[PDB]
Amino acid sequence: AELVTNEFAGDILISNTTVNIWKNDGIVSLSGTISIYNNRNSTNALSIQIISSTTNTFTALPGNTISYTGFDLQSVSVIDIPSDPSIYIEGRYCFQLTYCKSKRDCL
Amino acid sequence: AELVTNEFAGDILISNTTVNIWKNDGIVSLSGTISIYNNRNSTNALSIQIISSTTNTFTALPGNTISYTGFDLQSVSVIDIPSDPSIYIEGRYCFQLTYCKSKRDCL
Amino acid sequence: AELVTNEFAGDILISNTTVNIWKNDGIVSLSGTISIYNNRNSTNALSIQIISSTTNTFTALPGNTISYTGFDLQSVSVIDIPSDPSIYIEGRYCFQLTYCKSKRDCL
Amino acid sequence: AELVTNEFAGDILISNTTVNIWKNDGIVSLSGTISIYNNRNSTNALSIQIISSTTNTFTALPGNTISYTGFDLQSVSVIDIPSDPSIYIEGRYCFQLTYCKSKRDCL
Amino acid sequence: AELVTNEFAGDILISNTTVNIWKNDGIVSLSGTISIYNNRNSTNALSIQIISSTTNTFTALPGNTISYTGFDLQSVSVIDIPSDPSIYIEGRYCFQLTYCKSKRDCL
């Protein structure tokens, strides 16, 4: 076996609903770091649920990045989106995820 | 054997049909991450079907990236394209795919 | 033995004929990803035939990239080029190809 | 096993409360360096609590970066935020964290 | 032994003759990819002969890149250059060549 690391980023734009921004397949064991930035021009805090072996909730105020590092990462969702007609949340995420891949069944 | 990683990106432009944007050969076992961005200037949501050992459907609203990580990735298609004469969907995809390659039958 | 990866790109300009854009030597076993972009300024769809252990045909509409990943890649050709005197197709391709090379007969 | 290093940065904006800016999952053993910059345009000092096997408190004056290197890094928080209605603290953090990951349970 | 890869590019300017643009020494066993671009401002097609274990001839129309991947690469020549006093062919080549080198007779 060898470890494989994937590094990726993405955008969040919101302008009580849950929006899933990342998930695994329920099979892959993923460890690593998740970072979520909420832009300083956002009207509201960004509430994030990270599901691993535990459920953790974080709040990023406008202009702040939250970061989490752990094992068995399963999903990341934006939660508790307020029902404000003037809502504007601009954000960015970055992920560094590592899993293990077998080389036995190699073509 | 050794693992090989391919990293590639591409564009999506749509201006109920299914459009296949990526597929494998049905033989290669591919693991990795797929990211699909729908540009903020799009008129509609981008519906994506990812086929692996399971079929998953995702929806990217304008200005959002969806990401998926899994084993046995087989195809990615845009699905549920609406019959609107004013439709405009601009998007981008990024893939990090890893497979296993033998070194036995080497020239 | 070791695996070798070649990464290369090239241009397509057309302004029923078949144009071969890439082929192997018929000996090298090549696996990897092929991406074909058809520029948004093209007048027509780009029809592509990829020959491996199977023959696959793809169509890239103007502004779209098609991608394929597989084993035993042998050739890529533009096919079904229409007999229009006003035809303009501008495109680009990208390839990530991996083969296996012996180190026994080393100088 | 192999070591994995994650490198990440983020922003701090404050305009007695504690704000957690980074934490681990309580399982991952993280070693590395933490750097915290307080911008020269800040009105106040930035007080930082780093929790590892010990609790350390640091103060970054406006225009200064503090750095810490250690084992068993668990969390970083902004602490002792003053109750001033004219407070403005702009900062940045950088982290280089290394953990160990097994390759036994590899897919 | 170890494999060595050389990557190089060069220019072609023509403004029935054969022009050799690359050759080996007749001893080194070279495998890899050859790409030949003919610029869109060229007046004529670029005819290329690639000698390996077989002789292959390719034609690049103005604005097109041809690519070839194989073993035992020996030479590349421009062939069938027309006797036109107004001829202008501007082109570029790219090569990724791999050979094997012994470490027995090491100083």
Added chain:
Amino acid sequence: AELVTNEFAGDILISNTTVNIWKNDGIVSLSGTISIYNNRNSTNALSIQIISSTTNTFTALPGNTISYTGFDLQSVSVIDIPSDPSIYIEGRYCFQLTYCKSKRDCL
């Protein structure tokens, strides 16, 4: 075990006190290089104490960088800061620190 290298930089701004700019946890054995620059616009010399297995004091005049390389690096402090109401010291530091990390207790 494997070696881990951390590379980091930071700013110094002073506008007899001791200011600690970096320290370890008292457990990690760190080897490497420390460089301290005092900007040419500074009014005074920058006095630096580097604690390792020995205590070394250095003085960087305005526009000069001092560098030190050694084992068992423990802390770096600015020392002997003069009581001048017109003092202005702008500086920068750079560190390349290497430690050893076990892979026995790997998750």
Added chain:
Amino acid sequence: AELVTNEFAGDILISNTTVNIWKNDGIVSLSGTISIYNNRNSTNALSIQIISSTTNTFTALPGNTISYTGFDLQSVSVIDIPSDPSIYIEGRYCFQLTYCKSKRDCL
């Protein structure tokens, strides 16, 4: 032993003489690629002698690069420089040379 690769470039300016542009020490066994460009503003062809186990002569017309790949590379010289008072040859070379180096007599 290990292989070492050196990559270097240089300029040629001439404004029947032989000019040696590169040579080895007569001991080192060098394999690799030599590329010689003759600038499009040159008045004359650039004649190049490459000495290896064989002597090869090449001619680069203005605006062309010649390339050679082989073993036992010993020297490269400009040859057959014409006795023209208005001669102007501007050129560039690039070399990728690999040799083998022992690690037995290591300090």
Added chain:
Amino acid sequence: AELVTNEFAGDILISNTTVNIWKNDGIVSLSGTISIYNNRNSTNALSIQIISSTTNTFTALPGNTISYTGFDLQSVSVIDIPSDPSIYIEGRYCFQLTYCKSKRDCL
């Protein structure tokens, strides 16, 4: 054990005294290259003493770089600084130093 390389640069500004610009701890065995540049705007030569297993003195005239490569590098100092009230020496140094670090006493 593994080798560690540190690469660093710094500035020299002088506007018979000895100024130590770099030293080791007297324990670390450092091998590598030292380069010292004296700027073309300097009024005087830069005299440099490099202490290793031997003491070497070098002189860099304005606009020249001196370089030295050796084992057991211990210190570099500017020496023989003239007592001229109009002296201006601007310089830069670059170091590539390699030492050996054990992995036995790893945390």
Added chain:
Amino acid sequence: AELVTNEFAGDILISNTTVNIWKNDGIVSLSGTISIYNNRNSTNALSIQIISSTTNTFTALPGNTISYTGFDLQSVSVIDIPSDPSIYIEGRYCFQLTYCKSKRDCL
């Protein structure tokens, strides 16, 4: 043991004397490539002596780079500098040097 490669460059400015631009310590066995450029604005040729197991002399005319590759490189000097009051030689050197370093006496 492992091989270590140092890569460095420097400037030459002269505006019969010998100027040593590089030397080793007389202990380190250095192999590699030396390149010496003489700028096109120089009034005179640059004569270079390279000492290895043999003494070689080279002449770089204005606008030319000379290159040499060999074992047991010991020193490079500018030689035969003419006694002209209007002399101006601007040059640059580049070195890629490899030596062998033991890991037995590791701290």
